[PDB]
DNA sequence: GCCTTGCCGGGTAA
DNA sequence: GTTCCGGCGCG
DNA sequence: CGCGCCGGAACTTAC
DNA sequence: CCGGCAAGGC
């Protein structure tokens, strides 16, 4: 139940954010768990309290920074402990249980899927990661294909078959699993 | 006839 | 999305 | 001394 | 990410 919420946030983080190990001069350093998003509302009102809860549970001390940018808002937690918590979880992604599979995919979709829903698509330059989401989806009964969408930027797309749309939306985008 | 989906360019939201 | 900056906290 | 949080912001491009 | 084009399947 903390694993699930983590799985979700990790999707957002990979999708619209980053994991940053900075080195300064010196020998100063910083470690950031970052999700950036356009709706200063969404961040403050849905993403942040999820992350907050995780922070409290992992007994992390860092605060949640929300920095206004020109084009988007940025949720940022500066924390060595949290950085490694996510980075480590990333390397272990292939072993996600079902609950986490679903949560991670939902987070990834919310960050960079087709949100119009006229089509079901997930974009990403990381074929290997799409490959893993593809296998999980095949196991959930949701057919799909991967090809290179954007020849310009090396960006792949995972196309979910509208044949299986209900299954995908009802058991993933509309899941209460947390 | 109707639907699905690969393909590709614009530029918002990362 | 990624990485510069200056500044501060801490043992 | 040596690292790790904070608050921002320019610079960059993958969706 | 969007969204229009047109090929291809039933
Ligand atoms: Mn991404
Ligand atoms: Mn997004």
Query: Could you give the domains of chain A?
Result: 1-96 (3.10.28.10), 100-178 (3.10.28.10)
Distance from residue A21's CA to nucleotide D6's C1', rounded to whole Å: 15
What is the spatial distance between Cα A160 and Cα A178, in angstroms, rounded to a whole number? 24
Quick one: tokens of A47? Answer: 């993403």
Listed residue (A63, A90, A80) closest to A21, CA to CA = A80
Resolution in A: 2.8
Strand C nucleotides within 7 Å of a protein CB = 1-9
Buried b (16+ CB within 10 A) or exposed e, A79-114: beebbebbeebeeebeebeeebbbbbbbbbbbbbbe
Cross-strand partners of A139 = none
SS3 state of residue A109: helix
Q: What is the DSSP letter of A176?
A: -
Strand E nucleotides within 7 Å of a protein CB = 1-3
What is the spatial distance between Cα A124 and Cα A69, in angstroms, rounded to a whole number? 23
Q: Please check whether strand E approaches the CB of A57 to within 7 Å.
A: no
Cross-strand partners of A64 = A77
Q: Please check whether strand B approaches the CB of A150 to within 7 Å.
A: yes
Q: Which residues of A are catalytic?
A: 16, 112
Q: Please check whether strand B approaches the CB of A63 to within 7 Å.
A: no
Tell me which residues from 58 to 117 on chain A have a beta carbon below 7 angstroms from nucleic acid strand E: 111-116
Tell me which residues from 129 to 168 on chain A have a beta carbon below 7 angstroms from nucleic acid strand C: none
Distance from residue A112's CA to nucleotide D5's C1', rounded to whole Å: 30
Q: Return the ligand number nearest the Cα of A107.
A: 2
Q: Rg of chain A's alpha carbons, rounded to an integer?
A: 17
Listed residue (A114, A39, A116) closest to A71, CA to CA = A39
Q: What is the DSSP letter of A69?
A: -
Q: What is the DSSP letter of A119?
A: S
């Amino acid at each position: 139940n903390v694993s699930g919420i983590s799985a979700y946030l990790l999707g957002l983080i990979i999708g619209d954010g980053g994991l940053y190990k900075l080195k300064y001069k010196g020998n100063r350093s910083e470690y950031r768990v970052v999700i950036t998003a356009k709706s200063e509302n969404l961040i403050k009102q849905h993403i942040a309290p999820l992350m907050q809860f995780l922070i409290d549970e992992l007994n992390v001390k860092s605060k949640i920074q929300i920095v206004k940018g020109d084009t988007r808002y940025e949720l940022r937690v500066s924390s060595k402990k949290l950085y490694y918590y996510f980075a480590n979880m990333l390397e272990r992604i292939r072993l996600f249980n079902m609950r986490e599979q679903i949560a991670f995919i939902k987070g990834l979709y919310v960050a960079e899927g087709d949100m119009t829903l006229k089509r079901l698509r997930i974009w990403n330059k990381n074929k290997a990661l799409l490959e893993i989401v593809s296998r999980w989806l095949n196991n959930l009964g949701v057919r799909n294909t991967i090809h290179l969408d954007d020849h310009r930027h090396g960006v792949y797309v995972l196309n979910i078959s509208l044949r299986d749309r209900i299954k995908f939306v009802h058991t993933i985008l509309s899941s209460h699993l947390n």
